[PDB]
Design a protein around this ligand. Structure first.
Ligand SMILES: *[C@@H]1O[C@H](CO)[C@@H](O[C@@H]2O[C@H](CO)[C@@H](O[C@@H]3O[C@H](CO[C@H]4O[C@H](CO)[C@@H](O)[C@H](O[C@@H]5O[C@H](CO)[C@@H](O)[C@H](O)[C@@H]5O)[C@@H]4O)[C@@H](O)[C@H](O[C@@H]4O[C@H](CO[C@H]5O[C@H](CO)[C@@H](O)[C@H](O)[C@@H]5O)[C@@H](O)[C@H](O)[C@@H]4O)[C@@H]3O)[C@H](O)[C@H]2NC(C)=O)[C@H](O)[C@H]1NC(C)=O
Ligand SMILES: Nc1ncnc2c1ncn2[C@@H]1O[C@H](COP(=O)(O)OP(=O)(O)OP(=O)(O)O)[C@@H](O)[C@H]1O
Ligand SMILES: [Ca+2]
Ligand SMILES: [Ca+2]
Lengths: 260, 374
């Protein structure tokens, strides 16, 4: 299976109306069997719909979707989008993290995580949850630490140890310094393997920051990842793009991994 | 002792209004659209939903093929109308249709057959105990506490003039002007896009309707207004787009509803509201006419604009024979008048007699047999 987490900047109508930018997104989304698209600011799911119109064009089932509601603590709001190939995997259950109270998701996260239970019939792990997080860069250390209590919650709900956590964690540069990694349970505990290292560059910008990360917990899931497959995919280098053109698609790179 | 509660549904081209007999306002107001998922998938706390109706359909419209089942007051697609009625009882109203008498409203000059397919879905599919179907405009008038007047009712997809005398609409003096709310919102989007503003996204286009409802108004004398705006700034108002960038319109504000008086502005070679009202009254019997000019009631969402009442007053007076006491009555709650009407009637114990029950339906339902005044 090949899965990515891509933060596509201001994914929305305008963006998806521009046929050159849409072509590119389509070419990038098609590499993956499960891709998480963050920063979906699409009030009426028009751009998600247009994207899907592109993907499902000659087989109405090349991709199915899972999408949350606008999330954010009453401000700018964005959606989490999971698109998958239903012939490769299946979503058994989904939920949006909250704590034990309805306002409560938002006490620990600005865009409270969506977690999805997949069945994979092609890989050694046969069942696993993906939890998505796009952190709010000023709250990044705290959120990525709270992501550990969401791993706990998925184990208590779904009796699932195999948990892949991924997204634009803002987990580098000025939002998370070397010294602050000791405050992040998610990283401190040996339960978790960080597949995108700190040296990576996952920003399309001239910054060198491992903003976007993929974490895997559970020994079965840790055994399914193909070693050396987790990387940012640099579409600018891949499709021989100019700077301008590459940033028009996004200021981030998809971070992908392969499971077997 | 509380009597078993009837429901009132008013299914308009843009909005369904629904609720309980006795209340002052529809407990439910949602748009009249049905949407089917263009693609398979799921919302995060949710099971795959096969269809959406109302707010939900418009919130997610980007991934649905939307359907509008009521075209200009008339039910056009009966399958999607079942989805709506269905939604109204079980989701919105939270009732079991089997134990509540439902009163439904209909358009002026609604096809005899349609009223019947409506009677049949209620009884056959919704198994309503007893049910009534009233004409939208009569309900607005009775809601004014009266049984004689002429009504202008202007919604989202149709506008009608309806003379009613002693409680029944006078069928061939009814005028139908195919111009209402949606046309005005589109005209305002026309105006503002000429002016270099763009409303391209769904969110952006959605808000035009709101500047419409907020800042548009009817000039008592279009021509003078037009001069005021050319020389001042007093008529100008701004509005913040959802994206923080602002909008500032000034003459636009009375230009868009002016379409109701001068359909010229949207290329609609047809007559305007004031004259449609006049012409209906002239098809009436010359004795009731005095009463019509004095009980000229306004009804509907497009009837909302500030100023509109004064221009109907003025325009009909310069057209009406010099001794007629013209009275334009515009109720504060008039965007809900039909529903309110429907509630008020359904509440009277008297009305329990006119209510057709499924028992009567063992003996078929012909209902309409349409009629006179010309
Ligand atoms: C959809 O989404 C896309 C992306 O978001 C949108 O596209 C961008 O939109 C802007 C504005 O509309 C475009 O700008 C016009 O194009 C030229 C600007 O680019 C020039 O800049 C330098 C040289 O100055 C150079 O880098 C460019 O060449 C390319 O570089 C890349 C990277 O190295 C290479 O891979 C490519 O192969 C190219 O070689 C390019 O030359 C300008 O033409 C234009 O300005 C006008 O130019 C007129 C002509 O005069 C001279 O201008 C320059 C300098 O000498 C030169 O280009 C030209 O040959 C002439 O010698 C002049 O008379 C006018 O007065 C004016 O100055 C615009 O700036 C931009 O390129 C689009 N592409 C990208 C990738 O961003 C798109 O609009 C969206 N919308 C829709 C509906 O699709
Ligand atoms: N304050 C306002 N000023 C102007 N337009 C308004 C105002 N309030 C509501 N509207 C408009 O009224 C229209 C909806 O009115 P209404 O509910 O009477 O129509 P409807 O019953 O859906 O359709 P129809 O009666 O035409 O079949 C919409 O165009 C809405 O924008
Ligand atoms: Ca970079
Ligand atoms: Ca109506």
């Amino acid at each position: 299976l090949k899965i990515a987490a891509f933060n596509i900047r201001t994914f929305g109508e305008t963006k998806m109306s521009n046929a050159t930018l849409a072509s590119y997104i389509v070419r990038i989304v098609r590499r993956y069997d499960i891709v998480l698209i963050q920063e979906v600011r699409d009030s009426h799911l028009v751009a998600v719909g247009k994207l899907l119109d592109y993907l499902n064009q000659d087989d109405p089932n090349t991709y199915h979707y899972v999408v949350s509601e606008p999330l954010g603590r009453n401000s700018y709001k964005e959606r989490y989008l999971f698109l998958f190939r239903p012939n490769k995997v299946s979503v058994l259950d989904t939920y949006q993290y909250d704590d034990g109270c309805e306002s409560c998701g938002n006490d620990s996260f600005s865009r409270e995580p969506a977690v999805v239970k997949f069945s994979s019939h092609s890989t050694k792990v046969k069942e696993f949850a993906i939890v998505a997080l796009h952190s709010a860069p000023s709250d990044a250390v705290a959120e990525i630490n709270s992501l550990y209590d969401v791993y706990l919650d998925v184990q208590q709900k779904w009796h699932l140890n195999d948990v892949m956590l991924m997204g634009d964690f803002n987990a580098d540069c000025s939002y998370v310094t070397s010294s602050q990694w000791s405050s992040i349970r998610l990283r401190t505990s040996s339960t978790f393997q960080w597949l995108i290292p700190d040296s990576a560059d996952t920003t399309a910008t001239s910054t060198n920051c491992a903003y976007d990360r993929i974490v895997v917990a559970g020994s079965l899931l840790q055994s399914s990842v193909v070693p050396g497959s987790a990387a940012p995919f640099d579409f600018q280098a891949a499709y021989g793009l100019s700077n301008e053109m590459a940033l028009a698609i996004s200021d981030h790179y998809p971070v992908e991994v392969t499971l077997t | 002792e509380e009597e078993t509660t009837a429901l009132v549904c008013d299914n308009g081209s843009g909005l369904c209004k629904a609720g309980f007999a006795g209340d002052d306002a529809p407990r439910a107001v949602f748009p009249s659209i049905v949407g089917r998922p263009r693609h398979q998938g799921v919302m995060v706390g949710m099971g795959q939903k096969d269809s959406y109706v109302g707010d939900e359909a418009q919130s997610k419209r980007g991934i649905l093929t939307l359907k509008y089942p009521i075209e200009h007051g008339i039910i056009t697609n009966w399958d999607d109308m079942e989805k709506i009625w269905h939604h109204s009882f079980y989701n919105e109203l939270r009732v079991a249709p089997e134990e509540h008498p439902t009163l439904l409203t209909e358009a002026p000059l609604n096809p005899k057959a349609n009223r019947e397919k409506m009677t049949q879905i209620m009884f056959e599919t919704f198994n309503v105990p007893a049910m009534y179907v009233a004409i939208q405009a009569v309900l607005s008038l009775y809601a004014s506490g009266r049984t004689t007047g002429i009504v202008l009712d202007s919604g989202d997809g149709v506008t009608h003039n309806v003379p009613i005398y002693e409680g029944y609409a006078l069928p061939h003096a009814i005028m139908r002007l195919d111009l209402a709310g949606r046309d005005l919102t589109d005209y305002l989007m026309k105006i503002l896009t000429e002016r270099g503003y763009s409303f391209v996204t769904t969110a952006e286009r959605e808000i035009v309707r709101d500047i419409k409802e907020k800042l548009c108004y009817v000039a008592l004398d279009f021509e003078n207004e037009m001069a005021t705006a050319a020389s001042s700034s007093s008529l100008e108002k701004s509005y913040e787009l959802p994206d923080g960038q602002v909008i500032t319109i000034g003459n636009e504000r009375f230009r868009c509803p002016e379409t109701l008086f001068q359909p010229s502005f949207i290329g609609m070679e047809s007559a305007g509201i004031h004259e449609t009202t006049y012409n209906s009254i002239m098809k009436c019997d010359i004795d009731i006419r005095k009463d019509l000019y004095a009980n000229n009631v306004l009804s509907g969402g497009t009837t909302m604009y500030p100023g509109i009442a004064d221009r109907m007053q003025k325009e009909i007076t310069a057209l009406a024979p010099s001794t007629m006491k013209i009275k334009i009555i515009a109720p504060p709650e008039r965007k809900y008048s039909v529903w309110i009407g429907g509630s008020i009637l359904a509440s009277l114990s008297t009305f329990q007699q006119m209510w057709i029950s499924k028992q009567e339906y063992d003996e078929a339902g012909p209902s309409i047999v349409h009629r006179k005044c010309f």
